[PDB]
Amino acid sequence: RFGFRDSPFCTSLPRTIMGNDVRRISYNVFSMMEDIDDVISEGFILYDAY
Amino acid sequence: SKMNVSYRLYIKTPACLLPLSDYMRAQHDYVSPSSSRVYIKDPAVVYTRS
Numbered sequence A: 001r002f003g004f005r006d007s008p009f010c011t012s013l014p015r016t017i018m019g020n021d022v023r024r025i026s027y028n029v030f031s032m033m034e035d036i037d038d039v040i041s042e043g044f045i046l047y048d049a050y
Numbered sequence B: 001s002k003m004n005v006s007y008r009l010y011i012k013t014p015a016c017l018l019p020l021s022d023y024m025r026a027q028h029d030y031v032s033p034s035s036s037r038v039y040i041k042d043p044a045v046v047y048t049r050s
Helices: A027-032 A036-040
Strands: A024-026 A045-047
Touching: A024 A027, A027 A045
Parallel strands: A024 A045
Antiparallel strands: none
């Protein structure tokens, strides 16, 4: 609506992307992780934090 | 030796002595661990991000 180039704003966070659900990770579990490269190769929704 | 010695004392032959012919019984093996090993002095610190 605004016209920003590559706007970082979404009307609502996508529940499903490309026909598959978007993975959700808590901030604590994400921080505790050690294989962040594999999970970042697809992208994920961070929650349980402000 | 025959005339001027009066009494004699005898004991078992000590196991320390070895005739020169039996020099192969002294062959023995020792083991030195590989020099590529690293011996750690730093301790292990535990933690959690929760």
